[PDB]
Amino acid sequence: STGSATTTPIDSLDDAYITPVQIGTPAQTLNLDFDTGSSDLWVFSSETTASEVDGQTIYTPSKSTTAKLLSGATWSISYGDGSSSSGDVYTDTVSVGGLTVTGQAVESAKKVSSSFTEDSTIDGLLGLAFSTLNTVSPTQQKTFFDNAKASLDSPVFTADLGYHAPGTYNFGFIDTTAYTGSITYTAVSTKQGFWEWTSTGYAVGSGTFKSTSIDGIADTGTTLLYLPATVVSAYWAQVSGAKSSSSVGGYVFPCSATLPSFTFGVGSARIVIPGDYIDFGPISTGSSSCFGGIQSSAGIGINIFGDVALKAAFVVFNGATTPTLGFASK
Numbered sequence: 001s002t003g004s005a006t007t008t009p010i011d012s013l014d015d016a017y018i019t020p021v022q023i024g025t026p027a028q029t030l031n032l033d034f035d036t037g038s039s040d041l042w043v044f045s046s047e048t049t050a051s052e053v054d055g056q057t058i059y060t061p062s063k064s065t066t067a068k069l070l071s072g073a074t075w076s077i078s079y080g081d082g083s084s085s086s087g088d089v090y091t092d093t094v095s096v097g098g099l100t101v102t103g104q105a106v107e108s109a110k111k112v113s114s115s116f117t118e119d120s121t122i123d124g125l126l127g128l129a130f131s132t133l134n135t136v137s138p139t140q141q142k143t144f145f146d147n148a149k150a151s152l153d154s155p156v157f158t159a160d161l162g163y164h165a166p167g168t169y170n171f172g173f174i175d176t177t178a179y180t181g182s183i184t185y186t187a188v189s190t191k192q193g194f195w196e197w198t199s200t201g202y203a204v205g206s207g208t209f210k211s212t213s214i215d216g217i218a219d220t221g222t223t224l225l226y227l228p229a230t231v232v233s234a235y236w237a238q239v240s241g242a243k244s245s246s247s248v249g250g251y252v253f254p255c256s257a258t259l260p261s262f263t264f265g266v267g268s269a270r271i272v273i274p275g276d277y278i279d280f281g282p283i284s285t286g287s288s289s290c291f292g293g294i295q296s297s298a299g300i301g302i303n304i305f306g307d308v309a310l311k312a313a314f315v316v317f318n319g320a321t322t323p324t325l326g327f328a329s330k
């Protein structure tokens with residue numbers, strides 16, 4: 001089997017991406033944030049505290065003839081940005097782009113943090129990291145990809161995110177019309193539960209490439225590119241008037257600037273992020289100071305190849321016996 005679904009930016013800045021997901025019988029369609037850095041599929045629901053719902057579409061398990069309470073099971077997740085959610089668990093039929101899993105764990109939120117309430121466009125998350133990170137207790141549950149894998153034509157999924165435009169998540173096949181050149185594959189460590197790999201270096205604009213190993217994670221659920229402070233300083237030094245602002249929380253730059261590109265290495269191959277992908281707009285409405293899309297990882301503890309990086313590439317998440325990652329230009 002295979003599946004194919006379109007993923008769409010939630011706003012004009014690509015602050016996150018949503019993908020439609022069918023849950024239950026008859027289908028209830030919710031727009032979820034596919035997150036290759038976490039491993040829980042959770043949704044706003046008829047059980048979510050009423051004051052914490054502000055415009056989201058909810059899953060109502062009592063209206064699904066295939067929903068079953070997973071007795072005794074609970075979940076609770078604390079995301080690294082400070083967001084959180086928790087609740088109870090059902091199993092139900094879940095379909096993405098025509099690919100169906102029966103008996104998928106659907107984690108129903110009873111509580112969500114204010115950041116989730118405030119994003120009316122995001123109805124929950126669909127985790128695509130390794131199932132070792134799943135938070136359900138006392139019986140840990142599998143991700144949508146792990147449940148589907150054995151049925152797929154090939155044990156893979158791909159991310160093709162757009163810049164200020166829609167893109168695609170595919171399951172079970174590699175669309176050879178969706179990229180240029182060849183796909184370069186690179187080793188993955190699953191020891192922390194992430195799609196963790198090592199970039200071979202970077203360049204700023206038309207500058208020379210610096211060979212250096214940068215260990216980090218391929219994370220569709222993170223908006224920006226988080227890299228070591230040395231690398232980030234070298235980038236922003238090329239932008240007149242850019243500075244690190246402790247009050248704003250990162251590097252800012254004049255909205256009048258034209259930004260240089262940023263290149264990262266994948267083996268001997270190179271992925272180029274155009275400068276415009278690094279502009280996240282005014283820090284507050286009407287300001288002429290703009291927020292940068294490349295930021296230091298120093299406060300987080302791991303480097304993160306988030307959407308700013310991934311949207312410049314066609315990315316293969318290869319779930320073979322030994323997992324690997326592939327990157328192509330597009």
Ligand SMILES: C[C@H](Cc1ccc(C(C)(C)C)cc1)[C@H](NN)c1nnnn1Cc1ccc2c(c1)OCO2
Binds near residue numbers: 033036037081083222
């Ligand atoms: C933050 C997301 C998880 C999430 C997604 C969306 C949202 C909103 C809908 C409310 C917009 C909140 C949360 C990330 N996913 N892998 C993640 N989950 N756990 N760690 N990370 C990576 C990290 C960690 C720390 C950081 C960061 C990133 O950005 C800024 O500080």
